[PDB]
Design a protein around this ligand. Sequence first.
Ligand SMILES: N[C@@H](Cc1c[nH]c[nH+]1)C(=O)O
Ligand SMILES: N[C@@H](Cc1c[nH]c[nH+]1)C(=O)O
Ligand SMILES: N[C@@H](Cc1c[nH]c[nH+]1)C(=O)O
Ligand SMILES: N[C@@H](Cc1c[nH]c[nH+]1)C(=O)O
Ligand SMILES: N[C@@H](Cc1c[nH]c[nH+]1)C(=O)O
Ligand SMILES: N[C@@H](Cc1c[nH]c[nH+]1)C(=O)O
Ligand SMILES: [Mg+2]
Ligand SMILES: [Mg+2]
Ligand SMILES: [Mg+2]
Ligand SMILES: [Mg+2]
Ligand SMILES: [Mg+2]
Ligand SMILES: [Mg+2]
Lengths: 147, 147, 147, 147, 147, 147
Amino acid sequence: TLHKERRIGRLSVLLLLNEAEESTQVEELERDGWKVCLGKVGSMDAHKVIAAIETASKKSGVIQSEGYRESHALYHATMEALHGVTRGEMLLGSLLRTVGLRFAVLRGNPYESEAEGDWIAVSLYGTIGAPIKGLEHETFGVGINHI
Amino acid sequence: TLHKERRIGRLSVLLLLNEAEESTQVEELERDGWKVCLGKVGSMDAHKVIAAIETASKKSGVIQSEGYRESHALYHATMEALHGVTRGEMLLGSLLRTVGLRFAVLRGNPYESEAEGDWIAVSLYGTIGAPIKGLEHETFGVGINHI
Amino acid sequence: TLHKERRIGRLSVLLLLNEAEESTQVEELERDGWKVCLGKVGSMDAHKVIAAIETASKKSGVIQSEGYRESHALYHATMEALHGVTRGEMLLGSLLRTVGLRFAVLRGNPYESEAEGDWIAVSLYGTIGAPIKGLEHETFGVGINHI
Amino acid sequence: TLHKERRIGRLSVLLLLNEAEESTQVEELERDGWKVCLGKVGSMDAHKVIAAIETASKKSGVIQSEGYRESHALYHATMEALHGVTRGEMLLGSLLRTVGLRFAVLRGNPYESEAEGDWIAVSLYGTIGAPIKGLEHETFGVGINHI
Amino acid sequence: TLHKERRIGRLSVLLLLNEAEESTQVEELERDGWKVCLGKVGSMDAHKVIAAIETASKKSGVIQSEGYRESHALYHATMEALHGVTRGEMLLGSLLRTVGLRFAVLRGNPYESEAEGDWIAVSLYGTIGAPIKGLEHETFGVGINHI
Amino acid sequence: TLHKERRIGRLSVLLLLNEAEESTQVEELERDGWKVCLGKVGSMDAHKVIAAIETASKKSGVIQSEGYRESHALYHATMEALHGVTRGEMLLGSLLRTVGLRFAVLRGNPYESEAEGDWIAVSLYGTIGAPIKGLEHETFGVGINHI
RNA sequence: UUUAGUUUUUAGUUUUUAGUU
RNA sequence: UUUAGUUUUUAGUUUUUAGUU
Ligand SMILES: N[C@@H](Cc1c[nH]c[nH+]1)C(=O)O
Ligand SMILES: N[C@@H](Cc1c[nH]c[nH+]1)C(=O)O
Ligand SMILES: N[C@@H](Cc1c[nH]c[nH+]1)C(=O)O
Ligand SMILES: N[C@@H](Cc1c[nH]c[nH+]1)C(=O)O
Ligand SMILES: N[C@@H](Cc1c[nH]c[nH+]1)C(=O)O
Ligand SMILES: N[C@@H](Cc1c[nH]c[nH+]1)C(=O)O
Ligand SMILES: [Mg+2]
Ligand SMILES: [Mg+2]
Ligand SMILES: [Mg+2]
Ligand SMILES: [Mg+2]
Ligand SMILES: [Mg+2]
Ligand SMILES: [Mg+2]
C-alpha cells in the first residue's frame, strides 16, 4: 500500500510545478528522508535530456555513481517519463521538434512497508514544439521505478 | 507565445493534485474564463477511461455535445494523456494491469494571441498496478490539443 | 526497378477508390496477369478485419489455401496496412473506436525483372471513429510484401 | 456525416495518384473551395519530409504562416500520414532506409454540417527502400486532422 | 562488468533450449546459487502468459510472494521478454494470433561485483501463428531487470 | 508443421550461444542443407547493425546479392530481431545506449513440407548499455521470415 | 560485416524524389 | 502456472477509482 503522505510521484510533480522564489521545498523533502535533485535541460536530442538527468542525479547524490544497478533503475525511469513527453515516438530533432524542460528526481520509499525499499521518480515539465520560439505547447512525463 | 498566467497544462495538473475540502479552484478558473471538468474512473479497460472523460466533458459543457470537431480534439488529447499513463502499450487488462484515476479537462486559450483560439488539456493521475490492491504505483499523463 | 505500368500499390489503391458502377477494372487487371480480390468489412475488432481479408483472399484464389508461406506473407502485409489505418496503436474497440472498410488484395510482380517473383499488396480505405454514426473521418492503409 | 462529394482523404489521394499533363484537378478543387498544395520530397531524414510539407503548405496558403494553431494541426496530420509510410518505427536513415515521395495537402470541410469547420488531409505516396536504386517498394500514408 | 560464468541471459536461454538435460541443469544452477523456475503456457491472451510466469515464479520461490518490489521487477522483465515475442504490438488474439511457449525465470547476480545485487531474466521460446495448428513459426524473447 | 529436427530459430540461437563448438557446428548445418552466416557488430547506430548483417549475409551467400526479393526478406527479419534487442524503441545512440552483438543468419526450410520453401532466421545476442564499459546487461533478438 | 562505449544546470527556422553496407 | 488454436462480403452510444494469476 502507498503511504498517503509519501506519494513520490505526486511530490516530484508538485516540486517541479512550484515557482515560489524562496521555497525550501527541497529542504522539507530532505528532512523527511527523501533524496532530491532539480534541473533544467533543453534539446533536440533525447540523449542530451537523458544525460542531464543522470549527471544531475549522480552529482547531487540521488543515485550511486558506482556500479550499474542504480543507473539501470534511473535509465528505465527516465525512459518511462519520456513516454509522456514524446507521446508515441521517442524522437525530437528527427521529427522536427525540440523540448525545453525542468526535471525532478525523487528517491525514497513511498509505501507503508519499509520492506518495499527505495523507489525513484523522474518528472519532466516544459514545452515541446517546432524549432521556432512560440510554436510550442506544454509537455509532461513521470516515470517511476524500484531502486 | 504561451501566456505565463494561462499555462493550461500546468493549471490542469495543479487542479488534479490539490486535495482541499473547501477549494473552489474550479470557481476561480471559471472566473478566469476557463471551461473545467473533474472526474474519477478506474478500470481494466482503456475504453472505459476514454468514455468517462468524454461523457464528463460533454455533460459539464467543456466540449460541444453536437458534431464531431470537438469530440475529435478531445479524443486525441485523451490518447496523448494515455501515453503517459501506459508508457508503451495502450493496454490495461490484456497486460494484467488496472488503473484508478482522477482526471481534469481544461479548455481555453493559453497563448498571448487571442487568435490561437481554444485549446484543451486532459490530465490524469492515479495508480496503475497488478489487479491486487497495493501492488501498484503512481501514474500520470497529460495530453494537449487545439479545439 | 519497379515497372512503371505494374505499380501494385498504386493499382490496388486506384481499384479501391473507384466507384464506377460498371467497372470491369478487375477484368483488365486479371487479363494483365494479376490475381485480385475486393471486399468490405466493418468492426471494433481488428481480428475480424484480418480474418475477412484472409478469407476473401483464399476463397478468390489470390493466395494458396494450403500451407503457411503465403498466409504468412499476407498476414504481414495486412499488419502493415493496418498501421496506416490505426496510426500508432493497433487497437479499435479497446480504444473506443470502430472502422468500416473496403479492401483490395493484389498479387503479382511489380518489377522489371521476372526474377523478383510475386508480391502482394493489401489496401484499406474507409472510415474510423467513435461508435456513433457520423463521428468519424477517413482512414487508409497499404501494406506490401514478397510472396 | 461525411458529405459524399467532399471526402477530403479520398480526394487528396486521387490527386496524388493521377499523372495527367494537362490536368487542372487543382483548378477544380480550388473552384469547389478547397485549399490545395502538391509537392515532392526524398530523404533519409524524416525531419526533411515534415519540413517540405510544412514549407509547401505555408507558401501555397494552405495553412496560415502566422501563429501556432494551424501549424499544430498540420504537424499532427503529417505524423499520422508518416505512420502509414514507416509502419512501426518513424525512422528512415537510422534504419538504413530512404524514401522518395509525392505529397498532397488538402484543406476544407468534408462534412454535411458547415459547423464542422475546416479539416486537413496530408497524403503521401512513393517508394521506401534500401539506399540503392531499385531495392525499394511503394509506400503510402494519409493523416487527417481538424484545423 | 558481467561475470563470464554468470551470464544470466545466456544461461536462461540454454536452459530453455535443451530438452535433453533439464532435470540436472536446474540442479546445477541451484547449486551455483541461482533461483530457477521453468514452465509452459499457451494462449491467445497475453495476460495469461504474464500470469503463468508470475504464478510459477512465486510458487517456486524465485521471487517473494509478499510485497510489490519483486513483483514489479518481474512484471517489467516479462514485458521486455514479450517484446521479442510480439515484435511491435503486444497483442495476440486481437491480431488473430496465438502462442505456445516454454519459459524460464532465473534470479541471481550476473556481475563481478556483489554490490550489483540480484537481477532477473525471463526467457520465452515457442511458436506464434494463426489459430490453426501448423500455420506458425518460432518466437523468442528475453527480458532482464534488477531485483 | 515445423519439422522437429529443423527448427531454424532454435538452431540459429544454439549456434550463437556456443563459443565452444563453432567451427564444426557450421560444417554440420551446411551438411544438412542450411545456408549459414556468423558475425559480430557493435554500434550506437542501428543502421550499422543492419548493414553488417546484410553485408555478411550477401558475402557468405546466405542470400542473393542480386535483386530485391531476398534483401527485402532479410531486412524485415532483421527488424524483427531488433525488436527483441531494443524492446520498444528501435533506437540506440539517440537514447544514450550502445550494443555489442554476435549474430547468426540461417536459411532453409524448417517445415515438414518442401512446399513451404526457404525461410530465414536472424538471431542476435550480446549486451546493451550506457556508453561506459560494464554499465550493461545482456540482450537477445530473433526474427523469422519467408524467403 | 569482421563487439560498441564518458553525460547537467531550458531547446529552437525548414519545400520543389531519396540513395552503397 | 502446469503449450495455444478454424476466419469474408462496412462498423457503431460511453462518467462519478480499478482489482486475484
Ligand atoms: N505539437 C507537437 C510538437 C510540434 C512539432 N512541430 C510543431 N509542434 C507535439 O505534440 O509533440
Ligand atoms: N508496474 C506496472 C504496473 C503493474 C502491472 N503488474 C504489476 N504492476 C507499470 O509500470 O505499468
Ligand atoms: N479520430 C480517431 C477516431 C475516433 C475515435 N473517437 C472519435 N474519433 C482516429 O483518428 O483514429
Ligand atoms: N522494405 C522496407 C524498406 C527497405 C529497407 N531496406 C530494404 N528495404 C520497408 O518495408 O520499409
Ligand atoms: N507470422 C506472425 C504470426 C501469424 C499470425 N497469422 C499467421 N501467422 C508473426 O510473426 O507474429
Ligand atoms: N538498460 C538499458 C540499457 C542502458 C542504457 N543506459 C544504461 N543502460 C536497456 O534495457 O536497454
Ligand atoms: Mg535495461
Ligand atoms: Mg483522428
Ligand atoms: Mg511472422
Ligand atoms: Mg502537439
Ligand atoms: Mg511499473
Ligand atoms: Mg518492406
